[PDB]
Amino acid sequence: TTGRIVAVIGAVVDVQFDEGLPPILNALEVQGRETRLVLEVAQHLGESTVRTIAMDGTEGLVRGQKVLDSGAPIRIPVGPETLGRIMNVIGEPIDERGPIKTKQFAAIHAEAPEFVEMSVEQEILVTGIKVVDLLAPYAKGGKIGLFGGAGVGKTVLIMELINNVAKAHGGYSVFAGVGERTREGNDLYHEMIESGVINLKDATSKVALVYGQMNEPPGARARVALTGLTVAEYFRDQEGQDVLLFIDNIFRFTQAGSEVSALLGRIPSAVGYQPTLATDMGTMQERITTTKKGSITSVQAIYVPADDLTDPAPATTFAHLDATTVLSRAIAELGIYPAVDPLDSTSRIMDPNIVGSEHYDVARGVQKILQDYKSLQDIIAILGMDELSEEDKLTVSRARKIQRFLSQPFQVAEVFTGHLGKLVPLKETIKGFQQILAGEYDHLPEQAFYMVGPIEEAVAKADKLA
Amino acid sequence: TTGRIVAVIGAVVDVQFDEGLPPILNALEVQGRETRLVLEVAQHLGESTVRTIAMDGTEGLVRGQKVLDSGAPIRIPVGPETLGRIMNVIGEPIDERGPIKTKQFAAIHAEAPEFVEMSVEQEILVTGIKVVDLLAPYAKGGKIGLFGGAGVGKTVLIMELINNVAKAHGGYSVFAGVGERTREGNDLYHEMIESGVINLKDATSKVALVYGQMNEPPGARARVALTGLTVAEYFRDQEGQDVLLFIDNIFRFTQAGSEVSALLGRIPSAVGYQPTLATDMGTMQERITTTKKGSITSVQAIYVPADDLTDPAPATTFAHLDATTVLSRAIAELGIYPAVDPLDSTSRIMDPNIVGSEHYDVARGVQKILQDYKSLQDIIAILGMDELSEEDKLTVSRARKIQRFLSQPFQVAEVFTGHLGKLVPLKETIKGFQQILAGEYDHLPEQAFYMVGPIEEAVAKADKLAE
Amino acid sequence: FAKLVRPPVQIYGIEGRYATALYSAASKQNKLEQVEKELLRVGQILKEPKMAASLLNPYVKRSVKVKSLSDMTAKEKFSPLTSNLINLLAENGRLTNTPAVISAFSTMMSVHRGEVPCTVTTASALDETTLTELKTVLKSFLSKGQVLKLEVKIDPSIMGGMIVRIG
Amino acid sequence: EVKNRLDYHISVQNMMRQKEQEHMINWVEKRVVQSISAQQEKETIAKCIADLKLLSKK
Amino acid sequence: DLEETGRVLSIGDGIARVHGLRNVQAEEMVEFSSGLKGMSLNLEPDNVGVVVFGNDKLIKEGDIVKRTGAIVDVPVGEELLGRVVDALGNAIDGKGPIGSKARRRVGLKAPGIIPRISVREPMQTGIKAVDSLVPIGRGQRELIIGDRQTGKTSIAIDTIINQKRFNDGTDEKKKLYCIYVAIGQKRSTVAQLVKRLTDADAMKYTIVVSATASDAAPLQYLAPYSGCSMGEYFRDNGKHALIIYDDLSKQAVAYRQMSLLLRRPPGREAYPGDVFYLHSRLLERAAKMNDAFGGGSLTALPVIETQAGDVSAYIPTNVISITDGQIFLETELFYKGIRPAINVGLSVSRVGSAAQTRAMKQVAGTMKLELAQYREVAAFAQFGSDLDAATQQLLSRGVRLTELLKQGQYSPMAIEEQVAVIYAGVRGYLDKLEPSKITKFENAFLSHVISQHQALLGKIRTDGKISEESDAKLKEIVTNFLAGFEA
Amino acid sequence: KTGTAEVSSILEERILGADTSVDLEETGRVLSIGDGIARVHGLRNVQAEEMVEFSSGLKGMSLNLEPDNVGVVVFGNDKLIKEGDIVKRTGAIVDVPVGEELLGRVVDALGNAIDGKGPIGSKARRR
Amino acid sequence: VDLEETGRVLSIGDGIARVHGLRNVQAEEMVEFSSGLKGMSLNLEPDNVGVVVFGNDKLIKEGDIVKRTGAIVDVPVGEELLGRVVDALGNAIDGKGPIGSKARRR
């Protein structure tokens, strides 16, 4: 079927398909649009005319310019060969090594897993990173939201995570560059290239990069969310995967939703927000989960919008957040890479009755200790150490050991660290803390807890010294 | 005439009567409607169509359905037999004692009494509640507004007035539970039976109950007010009567209005509030009066959503008011029941004459000190306290005593209080403050004044506490 | 004002804004059909581009919307008050829509009534008739008569998919 | 421990039978859905019962 | 057989202007082609504004919308006590099909005063704090207001669990059919929850109506009314229904959005206000019925999830003004590890007493009060203040009492235990003990008395009212136990 | 675009030859009425800001001269009106009774001694 | 007539010419007005074209003929604009006559 430009007002193209009534979300390809000018059917206005949203820019728009309905949503390559390919949203490379070369294609909406599909009570994904595991132990399938230090090697940390896990457990990754600067995607690009977690000669390119950047029309960016999902579902179900799904920064996606909302003639809402904000999300989130198919585990860069949250979206997001990451400058400032703050590396599912107090209390003891120590840190800040009880002194040192024990070298940043990285097996980590907690090593170099992997290696590191 | 449902877009039932278009305020009876479905004509929309309001549900309607215009508003029995009867908006029982049989019938609108028809000057009524009288020295037959948030003891409070006072005034009353939270209306009801304030033995059951609940369409909720008014007007004019008119809550009327405005194809103006907020209300409030034939003393619950008063609605409200009972969430939260914002809770009839100067001055002194204190709150809030004039320190405490003294336990809500609440004959009150002012108590702990009745007793209460 | 009429069909506003005039006007004095037919003519009195140069270009002033006439009523033979509907389309510039008004109109004759009831298949078999689960059924044998099964049928559909749909 | 062995086999046969049932069903239905023009008279019985609607509704 | 159908006049936005079928009933639930339902809300002449339950990516223009010819009903029946359904009343549990082949109008009015009756019923939650301090009967609208798995959700769960004993009991007259209408809680969330319920198999006496996070908004919207209808049935089959409306806040969004999509504007807080009507009417159906309704009750525990504690927000204000009290929960306490995280200064049951036993009164009167004061001296006194012995005591004790109402998540209880342990504390049997060990004590104590003094407990349950002898027996039991607790 | 007046009552006669608009030039008939907003058809030549007089005996003021109708602010209520009342111009914009026999009076807005003395003179009248 | 490539100003009084005709006109196209003004046919409506007028009007009046340039706006590029004050056309306002930039670029 063909459609006609009946109206173009910016990237809202109302196309009268002059003979078609393809449902909404049916992807249209505009004919005479060399560059894949996808219009997504948006409303059936009547009159065989649909409001479509151009998802590619508008130009040269002949009145009645011809459009051929692609009749279903965008079908996109889905297949492992994407790992090592940067596509735009449309699933066209932007890695430009000709096309990406799956055969298994998918229309870019996927649907929620349902009750019957569930795997009813979730599971921690473990990274082997002390901070992660301890403080916000991840859930496989879980959507974790990254508030976090900019350019601190946030991404790097993420690479490291990918490294630790997606390698470890055979998870793969999808990166949805939402609202990314070309620059930032670049940054990543080389970071991955460099890291060799994208390998343009190896399938150790473990990440398909899908980009839905600012510079696109809204629709694309908006939809990049569905798209990214669609890939991971491919990996999930098909490749059985526990996927790590980076959608970064989903916020801008959201923005895009709202942007269009207006321009979908719709009322968005107060604070600009599309009133459907939640459903959009809900529906999106509900695709993302854990099932009898694996998990799509979501590592989501999440901007603190307007550094406020009052603004409904994050507020909603909180539901959609389940384990929470604020990556923290303080920690960073302490030179500690890991730079995470524990009191933020939390999980709404991190609750003792709801996960466990082994984390929660060993942590509470720890978090206590550090904070308590923080309470002392102000005291000490005035007084020095002297005055305290020795137990406090001990605890300070311990807190500090523990702290130091969180400093963990990077494999993916020998360039920064001058070290290999490390990983820490959770039991051993914890055990570690039991030791320090037990005070066991508090007669040892505290700074031997600095930058190590196993707590044993902190211990080891102490020894060579004394 | 017959009209056809041409559009029912919600309970705005757009009717086209082809069989003329007789005036607005025509009540239409929808034919084929299980519920006798009153529509009030609102607009002759033009071309044989009227916009009407369903006040009832909109069920089963087939667009076309015949409505036979009843051609005039809802006519309802009015007069004394309604007393002790629980009526619905459509002036029909829910007493569940069947029809009411007081054969003056009425359109629920009535229009404001002429200038001459007003009782020109009203004179203080009283209640005996210190706080109340003090700040709002009651006016005979006034419209008293309860600004107030979410029935927190608000509702209890209104009741409390009813209990002490509505009892105290012997003559008939009208209670309009508008939007009323039926459960409490049950309770109240049952209580009236219980108390024998309603008796199914007499209409000397001093209260006729009208309820126009919140499971109802707006159309009902908007209009029940008019209804209640019409009735009380019966008692006022016809029966003399200081009808005590309980409206809980006018807000829901209003609310009902605002909500429809949109649907009325109108603009639901600022805050969503209808353009006509004033006129509907105003005209309505103006229907309420103490005419030269009596009083409708109206204690009108005013929900103030999120208690904003700046909020146009209350802003308007003030215009009609006579005594404002402003409930203060700020106060309330301190556990205080009474909840009032005192220096907002007022009665215009503050007078060295009317309230006599004794009250007046005492009050003015009080008002002042509290106001002053008020100044201090801000100060201490930010400046801690402690270096102030010690007179202030004293007052601060005193104010709290005064406050506390203004606090009264609940006399009905021992269930809430675990106390009985009291009443303070006005002079003991004036005196009361004079006494505290006199510092007579003020070399004491502050504690005792809380939840008290008469000031002497607060002293008594002091003693027990002075231990 | 009026004491209007809308004989079978009734097309609301929807240019029925107009229609309703003639739905009492044609209707009254019962020039329904007479005029229906006025309209038929008009149809092609339309169909040239030139009649309605205001239609072509509104950029012709209401001069031409009073010379409309001479695209239509000046130009006309028949024009009892089908000239008047001009005078409305004229100010109320709606000439390009007018067919739909005409369409709407025809209801007169029995065709001022009718409807194809349909479950499946060809069911493009029209009805003008005025009595049903009567005429319909009879018709349903006229139609059964001959053959008749097209469009694309019961086969996919209700009937065919349906069992699938239970799955 | 005894249950754990058994219910796995049951569950597998159940899910397996549904993944046969669906797969045979779509394949049979997607093969044989053709003879409607060969036997018209599924629409003649539509018109038969449909005449006993067009008469026998009212 | 266009003689039961119409064509979608326009569709966009899941907003179906529907052509034809002017035969339409007001409030008719219609069915669109796709198995998707809609409701013909708005009868415009030339269309039917039909709310789409579901989505229109699953539709195209001109689509046939066929009458269902039905005013909204929900399937109703008791086998749903033992089912999780979607709003349409279809097994999203997927167990089998609904046993419910009764249907019931969802839009049934909240009955009158006379068609109702007040509460005298009590209802229990096993949550000490609750049953005591906002002692709740049945009918009652009580707002649960609270935040991100503060057990916010948990709270309902333990309560339900608690009813298990009752559903294992004979308190049929109190048999609480629980309806947890889950609004906005994702499939996963639900999955956990449901699962927990399964495990508890409270589900046998339970409907879980689930309109997850994903949902088409009208579904979400509808779902409570649905739940409501189903519960009204029970109520009306004499029973005592407990509906947990979870949460209308989200519903409100959904609706709002719906309104806005209906182009219908809103008021205050951008919120169109007849969501109040909505809910009010919904919640008005929460009531305690007279005898005619078999004394029924539908106790409503609506949930609104606070965010920001801006009760100030219209919607909370609304709800408060509707409810018969609220349980405000305080998160801070939660971080402190405190579940129940309540601020019962901010929780009230203005009712309270209809639900109470002298047993409870006998300890609670004092306690509630003690806590009030305690709280007061928590609030003014010592934290870096004074050291008056009285108040210091109140604090010690108080502090004790605090723990004592502090209840683990997944910990509903029998009332008698509760009165018992509470009694212990009330009567100051633990000032002489440091707070943590109370907890230990209690468990131990509890199991002890369960074991031996099940007699005594039994009795205490039986009379519903602690008795002086018992007091002594108890006292002894405790004192000694306590004595054991130490030594 | 639409035109209120495509009320084929209007159209419906203009066809048939109608005259004096369809509601007069100096009178109009209320096309739709509600809410003290009388959209009044006709009234073609009619001053801006004219005070008009209704056949509900009410006065109104022609605030809005729309090309088709007059938005007439009603100095009264519309339950007292039924659509199509003849509104006759007063020929005139509002002036108000004015005077100095107002001194000692309570008058309403329309300058009518509502005092209960009732009306009085109006020595002046005034724009 | 030319609709495709010309229009009559349907309404104007805003610098936005709703243009009757203009019926083949491309997105983003620079057009030229009967006022000597330029505009760009931004809004392609099914019926008329909202043309943002690249300047200021009264120079126009209704029905004015707007002709396609059939070109999307370009500006000269080069670097002889260096030392030049231009208007947004990339054309002088320096009043030094024209620049040396005789490449153009969309």
CA distance E154 to E200: 13
Q: By the 8 A CB rule, do A322 and A146 touch?
A: no
Instruction: Flag whether residue F2 sits within 8 Å of chain B, measured between CB atoms.
Output: no
Judge whether A140 is annotated as a binding position. Answer: no
Specify the 3-state DSSP secondary structure of E153: coil
Same domain, E209 and E102: yes
What CATH number corresponds to the domain at position E5?
Answer: 2.40.30.20
| E15 lies in the same domain as E99 | no
* Whole-angstrom distance, CA of residue A236 vs CA of residue A291: 9
DSSP state of C93: T
Q: Is the dihedral of CA E443, E445, E446, E452 positive or negative?
A: positive
CATH number at residue G44: 2.40.30.20
- Do chain B and chain F touch with ≥3 beta carbon pairs under 8 Å? yes
- Provide the strand spans (E) within E320-438: 325-328, 348-349
Is E186 known as a binding-site position? Answer: no
In E, residues 85-114, which contact C (CB 8 Å cutoff)?
none
Query: According to the entry, how was the structure determined?
Result: cryo-EM
B181 as an active site residue: the answer is yes
Cβ–Cβ gap F7/B115 under 8 Å: no
End-to-end C-alpha distance for chain A, whole angstroms: 80
> In angstroms, rounded to a whole number, what is the distance separating the alpha carbons of residues E117 and B186?
7
| Number of domains forming the structure of chain E | 3
Q: Are residues E352 and E395 in the same domain?
A: no
CA distance C66 to chain G (A): 19
> Is some CB atom of chain E closer than 8 A to the CB atom of C44?
no
Distances E42 to B8, B28, B392, E71, E282 between C-alpha atoms, Å: 6, 20, 64, 13, 20
What are the CA-CA distances from residue A217 to residues A54, A88, A381, E378 (Å)? 7, 12, 53, 57
Residue F119's contacts (CB-CB under 8 Å, 6 or more residues apart) are: F112, F113
| CB within 8 Å: E350 and B6 | no
Resolution of the coordinates, Å: 7.2
Q: Which of F32, F74, F114 is the best residue to mutate to test the B interface, defined by the most B CB atoms within 10 Å of its own CB?
A: F32
Largest Cα–Cα distance in chain E? Answer: 87
Of A121, A286, A318, the CB nearest to E214: A286
Decide: C139 and C127 in contact? Cβ < 8 Å: yes
CA A315 – CA A324 distance, rounded (Å): 13
Task: Judge: F8–C4 Cβ closer than 8 Å, yes or no.
Answer: yes
Nearest Cβ partner for E277 among B185, B214, B263: B214
| CA nearest neighbour of A230 among A75, A72, A110 | A110
| Tokens linked to A326 | 């604020």
- Provide DSSP, B325-350: EEB-HHHHTTT-SS-B-TTT-EETT-
Contact check, Cβ <8 Å, G42/A10? yes
- Would you tell me how many other CB atoms lie within 10 Å of the CB of residue E115? 17
Structure tokens at E226: 């649905």
The residues of A carrying an active-site annotation are: 154, 180-181
| Cα-based distances in Å from E19 to C123, D53, E50, E62 | 19, 25, 10, 8
Q: Which domain holds residue G23?
A: 2-71
Binding partners of G (≥3 Cβ pairs within 8 A): A, C
Q: How far is CA A445 from CA A130, A340, A394, B271, E267, in A?
A: 20, 23, 13, 66, 65
Residue from the list A22, A25, A267 with its beta carbon closest to the beta carbon of E260: A267
Residues of E in contact with A21 (CB under 8 A): 60-62
**Residues E276 and E420 reside in one and the same domain:** no
Residue B149 annotated as binding? no
* E192 and E60 assigned to the same domain: no
E282 to each of B215, E106, E141, E223, E278, how far by Cα in Å?
8, 10, 11, 11, 6
The answer, yes or no, to whether G and E have at least 3 beta-carbon pairs within 8 Å is no
C116 touches chain E (CB under 8 A): yes
Domain that holds residue E241: 71-356
**Alpha-carbon gap, residue B150 to A218, rounded angstroms:** 44
Question: What is the SS3 assignment for A50?
Answer: strand
Q: CB of E183 within 8 A of CB of E342?
A: no
Chains D and F touch (3+ CB pairs under 8 A): no
The answer to whether C23 contacts chain F (CB < 8 Å) is yes
Return the beta strands (E) in E168-239 as ranges.
176-183, 206-211
Please, where are the H alpha helices in C28-157?
Answer: 32-47, 53-56, 61-64, 86-91, 98-105, 135-142
Do residue F82 and residue B44 have CB atoms under 8 angstroms apart?
A: yes
Q: Which of E350, E343, E463 lies closest to E405, judged by CA? A: E343
- Three-state SS for B454? coil
- Say yes or no: E331 and E426 in one domain: no
Quick one: which of E110, E79, E107, E127 has its CA closest to E298? E110
Q: Output b/e per residue, B75-108; b: 16+ Cβ within 10 A.
A: ebbbbbbbbbbbbbbbbbbbbeeeebebeeebbb
Task: Choose one of E25, E49, E70: the last residue of a domain.
Answer: E70
Q: Is A9 helix (H, G, I), strand (E, B) or coil?
A: strand
What DSSP designation does F124 have?
E
Sequence-distant (≥ 6) Cβ neighbours of residue A14 within 8 angstroms:
A6, A7, A8, A45, A49, A50, A51, A52, G46
**Residues E173, E178, E179, E184: is their CA dihedral positive or negative?**
positive
Chain C residues closer than 8 Å to F12 by CB? 2, 4, 20-22, 24-25
Interchain pair C19, F11: CB under 8 A: no
Tell me the three state secondary structure of residue A82. helix
Kindly give the residue spans of alpha helices, DSSP state H, lying in A263-294: 277-285
Vertex A419: Cα angle to A417 and A420 (nearest 5): 125
A1 is in an annotated binding site: no
For residue D22, give the chain C residue with the closest CA: C167
The label of the residue with tokens 């609607």 reads: D53
Tokens standing for residue B348: 């215009």
- The number of residues in chain D equals 58
Residues of B within 8 A of E258 (CB-CB) are none
Q: What is the C-alpha to C-alpha distance for residues A391 and B400, in angstroms, rounded to an integer?
A: 47
For residue D25, the distance in angstroms to the closest alpha carbon of chain C comes to: 8
CA distances from F9 to C3, C167, F20 (A): 8, 57, 14
Residue type for position B113: P
Nearest-by-Cβ selection for C25 from F2, F3, F15? F15
Q: What is the CATH number of the domain that holds E238?
A: 3.40.50.300
Show residues of chain C in contact with F13, CB under 8 Å. 2
Rg (CA), chain F: 17
- With an 8 Å Cβ cutoff, are E256 and A43 in contact? no
Q: Any alpha helices (H) in A286-421, and if so which ranges?
A: 312-317, 329-333, 357-383, 390-406, 414-417
Three-state SS at A324:
strand
Question: In terms of Cα–Cα distance, which of E120, E131, E166 is closest to E363?
Answer: E131
- Which residue of chain E has the CA closest to C119? E1
With a CB cutoff of 8 Å and minimum separation 6, the contacts of E201 are none
Domains and CATH numbers, chain B: 1-73 (2.40.10.170), 74-349 (3.40.50.300), 350-467 (1.10.1140.10)
CA–CA gap between residue A214 and residue C43 (Å, rounded): 53
The annotation status of E407 as a binding-site residue, yes or no, is yes
Could you give phi then psi for residue E311, rounded to 5 degrees?
-75, -25
Q: Which of E460, E60, E129, E194 is nearest to E327 (CA)?
A: E129
- Touching subunits of E (3+ CB pairs, under 8 Å) are A, B, C
CB F15 to CB C19 under 8 A? no
How many other β-carbons are positioned within 10 Å of the β-carbon of residue E37? 23
Which of B180, B216, B259, B446 is the catalytic position? B180
According to DSSP, the residues that pair with E348 across neighbouring strands are E326
* Tally of residues, chain A: 466
Q: Do E202 and E172 belong together in one domain?
A: yes
Instruction: Provide, as residue numbers in chain E, all residues whose Cβ is less than 8 Å from the Cβ of A23.
Output: 56-60
The residues, ordered by sequence, that sit 6+ positions from A125 with a Cβ below 8 Å of its Cβ are: A137, A138, A139, A140, A141, A142, A165, A169, A242, A295, A297
Ligand-binding site membership of A128 (annotated): no
CATH number for the domain whose boundaries are C16-107: 1.10.520.20
Which residue of chain E comes nearest to B308, CA vs CA?
E312
Picking from B75, B73, B66, the residue whose alpha carbon sits closest to that of residue B17 is B66
Any idea what the Cα angle at residue A21 is, between residues A18 and A25, rounded to 5°?
A: 120
C59 near G CB under 8 A: yes
Q: Do B60 and E25 touch (CB under 8 A)?
A: yes
F83 with B21: Cβ contact below 8 A: yes
Whether E46 has a binding-site annotation, put simply, is no
Cross-strand pairs, E299: E242
Looking at this protein, which amino acid is placed at residue B151? G
- In whole angstroms, give the CA distance from residue C124 to residue B274: 50
Query: How many Å apart are CA A93 and CA A103, to the nearest integer?
Result: 15
Cβ of E3 within 8 Å of Cβ of C117? The answer is yes
With a CB cutoff of 8 Å and minimum separation 6, the contacts of C123 are C116, C117, C151, E1
DSSP G62: T
Q: Which two tokens stand for residue B67?
A: 């409505």
List E103, E339, E350, E461, catalytic entry? E350
- Determine which helix (DSSP H) or strand (DSSP E) holds D5, and give its type and residue range: helix D2-31
Chain F residues in contact with B20 by the CB 8 A cut-off are 82
The Cα E286–Cα E110 span in angstroms is: 7
Q: How far is E344 from chain B (nearest CA, A)?
A: 12
Contact criterion met (CB below 8 Å) for C119 and D40: no
Contacts with C144 from chain D: Cβ below 8 Å: 44, 47, 51
In whole angstroms, give the CA distance from residue B203 to residue B81.
Answer: 6
Q: Kindly provide the residue ranges of all beta strands, DSSP E only, lying in E214-338, ordered along the sequence.
A: 240-246, 297-305, 325-328
> Does the annotation place A287 within a ligand binding site?
no
Contact E312 B306 (CB under 8 A): yes
* Binding partners of B (≥3 Cβ pairs within 8 A): E, F
**E270, E206 Cβ separation under 8 angstroms:** no
Residue A196 CA: distances (Å) to CA of A84, A175, A298, A413: 10, 15, 22, 12
Tokens of E286: 């929460």
How far apart, in whole angstroms, are the C-alpha atoms of residue G45 and residue G42? 9
> Taking every pair of C-alpha atoms in chain C, what is the biggest distance, in angstroms?
67
CB–CB contacts below 8 A, C to E: 14
E354 Cβ contact list (under 8 Å, min separation 6):
E118, E119, E120, E121, E122, E135, E137
